[PDB]
């Protein structure tokens, strides 16, 4: 689970805070990555207000911050989906697309 302000890239609107997306049930199209690393687009098919949970702030090398729950999986450079806390503990590298749109 991700904090309110974490921004998601939408085709129609650009970057939106997931909190706003969820709490307004915003229908929008987002970008996903392939089994083989191809980028494509698809619609959001579900919306979850999870309520309150324990959140950590993970500061990245580039100044980016991710505020999430420990278990929240992110894509590694090797293409695996691993909980961000384990990525942090194991000093693993996050995949970063750079060429989304």
């Amino acid at each position: 689970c991700l904090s309110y302000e974490t921004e998601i890239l939408t085709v129609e609107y650009g970057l939106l805070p997931i909190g706003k997306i969820v709490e307004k049930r915003i229908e929008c199209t987002v970008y996903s990555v392939d089994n083989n690393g191809n980028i494509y687009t698809q619609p959001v098919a579900q919306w979850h207000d999870r309520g309150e949970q324990e959140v950590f702030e993970y500061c990245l090398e580039d100044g980016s911050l991710i505020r999430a729950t420990k278990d929240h999986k992110f894509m590694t450079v090797d293409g695996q989906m691993l909980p961000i806390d384990e990525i942090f503990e194991r000093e693993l590298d996050l995949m970063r697309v750079d060429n989304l749109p």
């Binding site: 991700l2 309110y4 996903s32 990555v33 919306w47 309520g51 324990e54 991710i66 894509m75 970063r96």
Partner: protein, 35 residues
């Protein structure tokens, strides 16, 4: 890209969105978040 540090924030409102194909999506800088 590496995660430099980690700090606790306490409880706060959190969220998830759903996607039907490859259950992931992109965030601001090109990070790929699950769900």
């Amino acid at each position: 890209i590496k995660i430099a540090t980690r700090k606790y924030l306490g409880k706060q409102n959190v969220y998830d969105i759903g996607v039907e194909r490859d259950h992931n999506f992109a965030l601001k800088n090109g990070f790929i978040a699950s769900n």
